[PDB]
């Protein structure tokens, strides 16, 4: 019936003075735009069909053509920024927001979906969707006593669109919009659908990616314990954004960091720091590095949880990117730690894998490591066990690598390495 029409045929039908002919052509357009293999989005745009689709959104008397055009427009907006813009330029934003109040759930859902694509394009369209007043009717769709009564697909789409309203960073979403969305977000974070949980976590990770005032808005909502729980989920699509959120949070103040420690996050890290997915190991190690950048009592918690052997482990063997984060974690630790904490690090076997990494062709990690060596020697000086440390480094081949780094391209590398030898070797 409406399968595989030409764009010419679609135009002919949409241009007829006949609502049913228009409906059939619009459905034909939706099927064209729904195919996986290279939908002719630009041809549809160039035919001038977007204003027609947008006007069909307003035809309350013909709910089928509202749905078909919403779907068609959704899929145009799912494309490039230029394609999303064409949709916005056709006046689609206020028309979709009006459709959020549709009596027909499949139509309001499609409107939710379309707005998600538009907002997902970037900060500007996100903020434009917010200015046209989308947040109130979106949240109203979720104002039910029990989220479980909503259709599953419907709830997932709403959650996904809300997360796009939270997404992107220059600038971040308006503070008032974030304040408005957060309580619904907190509630979605306690829902039992894995996709809803994933997208809720993504939203939270977006909101916590910024200055500490942004982090505080989220932390004040009391979500950290729920995030830590989700950190232990079996589903990788949930663990990943939960961990990003937790990692974001510990980039904050010592007090914000202490919240994730208090919530029991550290007991999950034996698994996270040995996780089969390299991205999880990397994010977990980055998170650890920011925890070792905290107070001495926070470093002590890392110790108590037995995580220093796991850091030695990752420094010893991991994807290089993960190893670099471990290097940071160690340099941070040795920077803020007590002498006893630093001694403990050495007794856990940090020196050999630390030295092994000095042969990396990455000048940044070298500077990081040399700094760590320095810090450990400073602690060893306060103990007068500098001799013992120098030997340890020599016995595992460290002195060789440090000797070589004296003739290094980078200024501060050459400097730091010579300084070490001229003071300890």
């Amino acid at each position: 019936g409406t399968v595989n029409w030409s764009v010419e045929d679609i135009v002919k039908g949409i241009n007829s003075n006949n609502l049913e002919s228009q409906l059939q052509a619009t459905q034909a357009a939706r099927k064209l735009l729904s195919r996986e293999k290279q939908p002719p989005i630009d041809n549809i745009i160039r035919a001038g069909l977007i204003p027609k689709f947008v006007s069909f959104l307003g035809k309350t008397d013909c709910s089928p053509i509202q749905f078909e055009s919403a779907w068609a427009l959704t899929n145009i907006a799912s494309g490039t920024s230029e394609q999303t813009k064409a949709v916005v330029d056709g006046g689609a934003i206020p028309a979709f927001i009006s459709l959020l109040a549709s009596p027909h759930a499949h139509i309001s859902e499609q409107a939710v979906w379309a707005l998600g694509n538009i907002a997902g394009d970037g900060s500007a369209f996100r903020d434009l969707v917010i200015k046209h007043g989308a947040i109130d009717p979106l949240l109203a769709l979720l104002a039910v006593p029990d989220l479980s009564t909503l259709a599953c697909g419907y709830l997932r789409n709403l959650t996904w669109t809300l997360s796009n309203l939270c997404r992107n960073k220059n600038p971040a979403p308006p503070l008032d919009a974030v304040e408005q969305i957060l309580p619904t977000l907190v509630r979605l974070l306690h829902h039992n659908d894995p996709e809803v949980l994933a997208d809720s976590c993504w939203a939270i990770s977006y909101l916590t990616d910024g200055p500490n005032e942004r982090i505080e808005m989220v932390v004040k909502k009391g979500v950290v314990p729920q995030l830590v729980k989700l950190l232990g989920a079996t589903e990788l699509p949930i663990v990943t954004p939960a961990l990003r959120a937790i990692g974001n949070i510990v980039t904050g103040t010592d007090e914000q960091t202490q919240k994730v420690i208090d919530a029991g996050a550290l007991a999950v890290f034996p698994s996270l720091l040995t996780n089969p997915k390299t991205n999880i190991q990397k994010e977990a190690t980055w998170t650890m590095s920011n925890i070792t950048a905290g107070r001495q009592d926070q470093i002590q918690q890392v110790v108590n949880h037995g995580l220093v052997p796991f850091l030695v482990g990752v420094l010893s063997k991991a994807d290089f990117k993960t190893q670099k984060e471990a290097a940071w974690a160690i340099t941070n630790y040795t920077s803020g730690g007590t002498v006893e904490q630093i001694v403990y690090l050495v007794h856990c076997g940090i020196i050999e894998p630390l030295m092994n990494l000095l042969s990396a062709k990455d000048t940044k990690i070298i500077q990081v490591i040399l700094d760590a060596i320095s810090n450990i020697f400073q602690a060893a000086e306060k103990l007068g066990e500098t001799e013992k440390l120098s030997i340890m480094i020599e016995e595992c081949g460290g002195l060789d690598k440090i000797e070589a780094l004296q003739r290094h391209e980078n200024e501060s590398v050459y400097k730091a390495s010579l300084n070490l030898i001229e003071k300890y070797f």
């Binding site: 729904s34 899929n75 499609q110 998600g116 997902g120 394009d121």
Partner: peptide, 10 residues
């Protein structure tokens, strides 16, 4: 992440 944009398929 999760996708920026989503096409609705048949």
């Amino acid at each position: 992440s999760s996708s920026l944009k989503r096409k609705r398929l048949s």
